[PDB]
Symmetry: none
Amino acid sequence: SVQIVYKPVDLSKVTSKCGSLGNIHHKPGGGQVEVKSEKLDFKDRVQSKIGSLDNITHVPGGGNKKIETHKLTFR
Amino acid sequence: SVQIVYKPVDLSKVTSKCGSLGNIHHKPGGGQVEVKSEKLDFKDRVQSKIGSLDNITHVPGGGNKKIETHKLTFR
Amino acid sequence: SVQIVYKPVDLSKVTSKCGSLGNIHHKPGGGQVEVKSEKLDFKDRVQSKIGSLDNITHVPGGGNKKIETHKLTFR
Amino acid sequence: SVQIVYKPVDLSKVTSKCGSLGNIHHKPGGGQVEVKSEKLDFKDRVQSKIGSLDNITHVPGGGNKKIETHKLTFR
Amino acid sequence: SVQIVYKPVDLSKVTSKCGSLGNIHHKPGGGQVEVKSEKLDFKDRVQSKIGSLDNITHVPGGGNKKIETHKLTFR
Amino acid sequence: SVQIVYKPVDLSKVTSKCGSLGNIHHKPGGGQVEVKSEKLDFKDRVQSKIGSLDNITHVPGGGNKKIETHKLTFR
């Protein structure tokens, strides 16, 4: 005779928490910002940001991947 | 006789929490922003952002992928 | 005689929470923004944003993908 | 604000296996039984079993009882 | 605001297996039974069984009882 | 604010295995049984078993009882 019993139990967490979670920003203040630009010459791409208070979150990561194989073979 | 019993149980979580979650921004102030530009000369692409208070979240990530394979081969 | 019983149970979650969730922005203030421009010259594409208080969420990510494969082969 | 989330999960077994299970009785032999009775006198109830091979299972027990009570009272 | 979410999940088993299950009785032999009776005298109820091979299952038990009570009371 | 989350998970077994499970009785032999009774006198109940090979399982027990009470009271 043969009896095979296959009863794995999984309660696992795979988890990510990414970027800005649960912060307190109590009354922050950006200063006065002044930009004067005169006679400038640009021969290639200009990428520009000007500002007093910038708050930025960027998240290319924080992804999750679970691979799970349950192979059983008899004879 | 042969008896095969295949009863795996899954309660697993795959989970992501990405970007800006549960933050408090209590009364943040952007300051005055002044930009003066004069006689400038751009020969290729200009990309520009000007502002007092910028609050940006960007999330290319945080994706999830579960691959699950149950296989039973008899003779 | 042969008996095969195939009773897998799944209660698993695949889940994503992406972008800006459950934040409090209590009375945020953008400052005055002034942009003055004179005699400028652009010879290729100009992309511009001007504003006092910008509140941006962008989410190319946060997707979910479950592949599940049950196979039972007899003789 | 109030949020109540009530998500109990039950996969429990209550199980009983009672009496004679999965036994092998390979070629059991009862012997010859002879009962001779003479001039006997019974003034009240007679209950009798006579036999060579008796194979008896009796199960007043093995019962199961699940009482389950979920209660949520608000104000 | 008030939000109540009531999502209990049940997959529980209540189960009984009573009496004679899955036994093998390979070629059992009852022997010769002889009962000889003379001049006997019974003044109240006679209950009798005579036989070579008796194979009895009796099950007053093995019953199952699930009581399940969900209650949600608001104000 | 109030948030109450009630997520208990149960995978418990309550289990009983009672009486005769998984025995091997390889070729047991009952002997010859002879009873001679003469001139006996019974003034009250007679209960009798005569036999060569008696193989008895009796199970009043082996019962199971799960009482489960989930209660959540708010104000």
